[PDB]
From a paper:
Our focus here is on a PLP especially identified as being involved in neurodevelopment, astrotacin-2 (ASTN-2). ASTN-1 and ASTN-2 have been shown to interact directly with each other in vitro in a calcium-independent way with multiple regions of each protein apparently contributing to their interface. Both ASTN-1 and ASTN-2 are integral membrane proteins in which a large C-terminal domain (extracellular for ASTN-1, endosome luminal for ASTN-2) is complemented by an N-terminal cytosolic domain suspended between two transmembrane α-helices.
The N-terminus of the endodomain structure is formed by the canonical MACPF domain consisting of a central, broken, antiparallel four-stranded β-sheet that possesses a distinctive central approximately 90° bend. The most distinctive features of MACPF/CDC domains are two loops containing α-helices which link the core domain β-strands and which undergo refolding in pore-forming family members to generate a partial or complete β-barrel inserted in the membrane. In ASTN-2, the first such loop (loop 1, linking strands β1–β3 and β4–β5), comprises 19 residues and contains a single-turn 310-helix (η1) and which packs against the Fn(III) domain interface (see below; see electronic supplementary material, figure S5 for sequence alignment and secondary structure). In an attempt to investigate the effect of reduced pH on the ASTN-2 structure, we obtained crystals of constructs consisting of EGF-3 to the C-terminus (residues 649–1288) at pH 5 and of EGF-3 plus the MACPF domain at pH 4 (residues 649–984), though in neither case was EGF-3 resolved in the resulting structures. The crystal structure of the MACPF domain C-terminus at pH 5 and of the MACPF domain alone at pH 4 were solved by molecular replacement using copy A of the structure solved at pH 7.5 in PHASER and refinement was carried out in PHENIX. The conformations of the lower pH forms of ASTN-2 are very similar to the equivalent regions of the neutral pH structure (RMSDs 0.23 Å (pH 5) and 1.52 Å (pH 4)).
Numbering used by the authors:
A (entry chain A), B (entry chain A): 718 to 789, 793 to 887, 897 to 915, 920 to 942, 944 to 982
The structure:
Amino acid sequence: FNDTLFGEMLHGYNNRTQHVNQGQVFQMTFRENNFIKDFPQLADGLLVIPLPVEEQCRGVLSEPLPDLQLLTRYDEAMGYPMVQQWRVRSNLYRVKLSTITLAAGFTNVLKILTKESSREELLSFIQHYGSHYIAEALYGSELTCIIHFPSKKVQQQLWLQYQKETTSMPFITYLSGLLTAQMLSDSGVEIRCEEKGRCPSTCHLCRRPKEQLSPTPVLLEINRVVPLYTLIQDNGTKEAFKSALMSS
Amino acid sequence: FNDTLFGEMLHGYNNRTQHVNQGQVFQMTFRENNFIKDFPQLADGLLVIPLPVEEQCRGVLSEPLPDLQLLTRYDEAMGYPMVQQWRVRSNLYRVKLSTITLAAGFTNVLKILTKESSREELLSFIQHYGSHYIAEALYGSELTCIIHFPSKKVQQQLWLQYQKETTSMPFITYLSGLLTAQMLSDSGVEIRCEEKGRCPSTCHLCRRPKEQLSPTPVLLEINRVVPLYTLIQDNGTKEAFKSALMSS
């Protein structure tokens, strides 16, 4: 119901619970032709521009951090278990909102809320339409990887020896290769990766055991959010909104 | 895994996402006999006392508020649709925490976090064990009711005429009675109610179409929460904890 692609900027954002898609503040109109190549008609009022090719597909290897999640005692040889993060991003898109046309339902519920300021009613309004609406957002396909290690010396030895094998191929690729090496001769190590948004075939780093072309970019990360009270225009519900916003 | 009744005070509380039960900070021990009548052995360190009989089972009728959720235009006769809230509470319990014995895993992950202060590591620690632990909490069985009305004059007419019929029976009971009256002669009104925690047979207000005796009180509402950094004792991770706590 009332859901399109790019997409989630329309429905707003609840800020205390970090939930998106709640209520509809503007109207998805198809008058303007804000088209994107190889994608259908988009709602009006939003401006979307892909990331530069320099940062279109980029993989970051976060610093090796101990494994605290699965650790829930000091040992010199044994870990100190380590985990690694390898986050690549492909088909990334910026989305702005210039300039939006307001909906009738949201402005009407404002009107019935502007004329008389009430406590429980404003609280329920916040619980429905959230408390803020998003301005800029970053969509795309993100492959997040986590690597489990037994000790602290093992991932350092792999780090240095792989630094010597490379110095044509990156770290995680040959890492998975020598992982397939122990599958031939047997050690007890597992690698986990999950993707938010299916990844295109334009980038090699995110290919999966097939491949995909022009996938639907999912909401990766947030940028700049703007509150909802500054849109009501009358102070009697400005101070009531930002006042009832601090209770919980 | 590592879950008992009363219960959730042990696992902590994530504060930005309002999620409970994440990681284990203390140890559930059964040495002390903090027993409650008609309930098994409870973990040590917590003190639980039932609410007074005056507030043991209490039903509040919130002020009639317009129906904004289903409204997503001005009309004089028609609504302005209204909804009502009827929240009763039974088998309520206070829980405190005096005095708790710490776990080995949480103090160990602290130790490996106290000795060296790191950014990503402290962030992941917060994402696991939350950011705060709860001190006082209110459990019980809560019946929340919401009533849907078409107009603004209809629930006022029902309010006054029911005030005249009563002045032996409350509002919602005879309300449901005359609701069954229209089921005999036909209008298009529905009443919704949901319960968090099954309700005992000690109170009549929360009985359901059978009855239940001594149900397990669920976590109703929160009271006083205490942060987790003030428990690490060393400032090098105090300022690192409360500093990495403000980024997101």
